[PDB]
Design a protein around this ligand. Sequence first.
Ligand SMILES: [Zn+2]
Lengths: 147, 29, 101, 39, 85, 198
Amino acid sequence: LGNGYNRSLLTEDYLLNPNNFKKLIAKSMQKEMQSLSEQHTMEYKPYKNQNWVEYIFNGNELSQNENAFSFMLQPMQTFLTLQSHLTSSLKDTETLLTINKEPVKSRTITEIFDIRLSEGLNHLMFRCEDKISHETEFMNFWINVLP
Amino acid sequence: FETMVANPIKVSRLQSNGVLTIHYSLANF
Amino acid sequence: HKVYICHTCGNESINVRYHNLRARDTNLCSRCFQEGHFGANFQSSDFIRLENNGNSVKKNWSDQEMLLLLEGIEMYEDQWEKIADHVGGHKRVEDCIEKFL
Amino acid sequence: KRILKEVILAKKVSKVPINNVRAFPVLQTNYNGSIPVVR
Amino acid sequence: IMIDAASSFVLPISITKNVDVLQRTDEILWFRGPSVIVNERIINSGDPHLSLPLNRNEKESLPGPFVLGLRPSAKFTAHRLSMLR
Amino acid sequence: KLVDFLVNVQSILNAASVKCHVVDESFPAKFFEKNPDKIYESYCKFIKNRTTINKRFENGEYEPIQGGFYKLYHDIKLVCTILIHFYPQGTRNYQLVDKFYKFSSELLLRECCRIATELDKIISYDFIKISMNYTVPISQTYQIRTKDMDLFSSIISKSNLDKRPHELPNTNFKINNVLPQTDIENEAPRLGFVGANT
Ligand SMILES: [Zn+2]
């Protein structure tokens, strides 16, 4: 098994929706949920009609042979943001993020990006590595955006 | 493995709808 | 007995197809419908569970056959051979006209 | 509808027959397909 | 917007050694998008967890998803199996 | 009140076991009475160290108490893990035991019930959260990068009680987890949309 190959970096990843999409609409029946597979709880909060879902990934007890994840987002939800809680920013950790090929730099331990998606599927490759210790971890997110 | 173009399975709509499953109607020798 | 080639793959449906009501000339297997392999245009509401088996003794006219007859009449507006095969091919022209009247 | 209720409250008439269609309509979940659109 | 795209693919290498659990053609079918997992098909349309009445921050850990799915009670199923024979 | 509540489960679990014969499988005493997360490791230790489920009711092994059904749940999960590990992952008697475990665990969870984020900093400031949370088990699909087509697989019918290491027919495969989508169903269109005049 690769569960003993669990992730030593990457405490938390957040695919929370941006505040622009809320601020341009709103100016709520919440439903938290967890998936029976160690971690990766998924919470959301619609109201009777916007949703503002949020996908969190607490990778302290995920495996690393199982990198990619897949979910489905609705056509009003085209914009996204992260929140990347690493363990410790000891070294100059390289955090690049290619949606399909284009790397996303930043918004400016915790680094925030800016994500704008298109219709159909997406790849959204994410990885972290150390300069000195020379160890890599990978994350993939198959986002199916509805037409 | 990344140079391994896959084979599309085409459905051909008239085959999907109503295909049944000629000498066995004995009128043609 | 006909054969129903499952759309979006090449498989054969066993005894239950899932008829689509907006392309109107496609079908699906059960497994391609449980997982949602029917394209992001359709919405899993417009798929009616139809059967494939030969029904009972004639002049019963189950709701599946009535629905497919009315689908055929909306399709072709004539051409009662193309209506009677779309019912399933186990009914004659001279009985589909006697039932639509 | 009040009056037909009250006798059933009061008299307990010997049959009060039961005939139901033994089904009732419920909503069911819908979901889009996962294969993306082709233009 | 087209309809008649293929949207399923087959690789030429016969890897049919450890694959009896997947969906086979009769090879392995490889689609153009993922699957969709649906928890329960039938919505439970009342139930103020979902209906949200306008009268009267609280959490509740309900047992399973089976509250929201119209399951029959077991006494009816035993009654119907008694009516079986 | 708990008299018929064993009789009905007996009748249902007998009649729903014809095609697979789970109930008539051999099962010795196996006194564990443990944490159900330890339910395979304890039987692994029982394999390392050293009366069937139908006959347990005929001997009256179950009382009208909480333990009197906790033992029944324990026995079902043991027999289902045994029948999962016994067969290969593709046989029909693998999937029948998986479906029977799902059905019986759902049947036994109910009727004993009768008997840090900037978006959260905006919304918990702006709204009131009445809530509801639950657990589902996810499943997996495979993943392939071909020349610009980027395919996917079907759902593996590997059960949630398999515990085996992940074998792969190719090392150019990848594996992914499918998060199930769940919410109030998006308002479906009316019947005038489905079946208009063409
Ligand atoms: Zn199919």
